[PDB]
Design an enzyme around this catalytic site. Structure first.
Site, short mmCIF file in Angstrom:
data_model
loop_
_atom_site.label_atom_id
_atom_site.label_comp_id
_atom_site.label_asym_id
_atom_site.label_seq_id
_atom_site.Cartn_x
_atom_site.Cartn_y
_atom_site.Cartn_z
N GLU A 251 -20.04 22.27 11.27
CA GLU A 251 -20.30 21.87 12.64
C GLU A 251 -19.95 20.42 12.91
O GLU A 251 -19.38 20.11 13.95
CB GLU A 251 -21.79 22.09 12.99
N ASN B 76 -17.88 21.04 26.10
CA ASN B 76 -17.25 22.34 26.39
C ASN B 76 -16.92 22.39 27.89
O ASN B 76 -17.77 22.63 28.74
CB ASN B 76 -18.24 23.46 26.03
N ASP C 137 -17.81 25.64 30.26
CA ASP C 137 -19.12 25.95 30.80
C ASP C 137 -19.97 24.74 31.08
O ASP C 137 -21.13 24.87 31.49
CB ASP C 137 -19.81 26.96 29.92
N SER D 63 -21.27 22.48 29.19
CA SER D 63 -22.35 22.14 28.21
C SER D 63 -21.75 21.26 27.12
O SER D 63 -20.57 21.15 26.94
CB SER D 63 -22.85 23.44 27.59
N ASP E 26 -22.42 20.03 22.91
CA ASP E 26 -23.06 20.26 21.60
C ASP E 26 -23.35 18.89 20.96
O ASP E 26 -22.49 18.02 20.95
CB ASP E 26 -22.12 21.05 20.70
N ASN F 255 -26.55 23.11 21.35
CA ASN F 255 -26.00 23.14 22.71
C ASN F 255 -26.99 22.84 23.80
O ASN F 255 -28.14 23.26 23.77
CB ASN F 255 -25.36 24.54 22.90
#
Length: 130
Positions: free
Chosen positions: A35, A46, A49, A51, A53, A60
């Site tokens: 990750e 992102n 959408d 959002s 992370d 998220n």
């Protein structure tokens, strides 16, 4: 902070991750490696959408932490996403524990399915004293 491999393994063990909801430390290490490369400051936006992370486990902002700018946020960890950018990972660990309390468990993170599931993951903890 960028953790060294075995430093992170011992930190996670002290924070109660080994065997939490059936998940071995090696599985948590494989998650963190893929990750973020063990980097607490990691962020990924992102665009699709809206959002983001955050942190070592790339948690998220639509479902888990609040950043104020993500539509349809839930804030299931009841935490500011800023807590997931600290050098101290206790809040990140508490929120990751919350994620895996849902039925999917660690499968919530796609990177775990791609890089860790059904693979030999012992490499991640070997030689660490855990």
């Amino acid at each position: 902070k960028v953790f060294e491999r075995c430093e992170l393994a011992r930190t996670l063990k002290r924070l109660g991750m080994d065997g939490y909801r059936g998940i071995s430390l090696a599985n948590w290490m494989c998650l963190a490696k893929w990750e973020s490369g063990y980097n607490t400051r990691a962020t990924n936006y992102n665009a699709g959408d809206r959002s983001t992370d955050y942190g070592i486990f790339q948690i998220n902002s639509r479902y888990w932490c609040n950043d104020g700018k993500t539509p349809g946020a839930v804030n299931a960890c009841h935490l500011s996403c800023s807590a997931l950018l600290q050098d101290n990972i206790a809040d990140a660990v508490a929120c990751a524990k919350r994620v895996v309390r849902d039925p999917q468990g660690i499968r919530a993170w796609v990177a775990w399915r791609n890089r860790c599931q059904n693979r030999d993951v012992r490499q991640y903890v070997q030689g660490c004293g855990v």
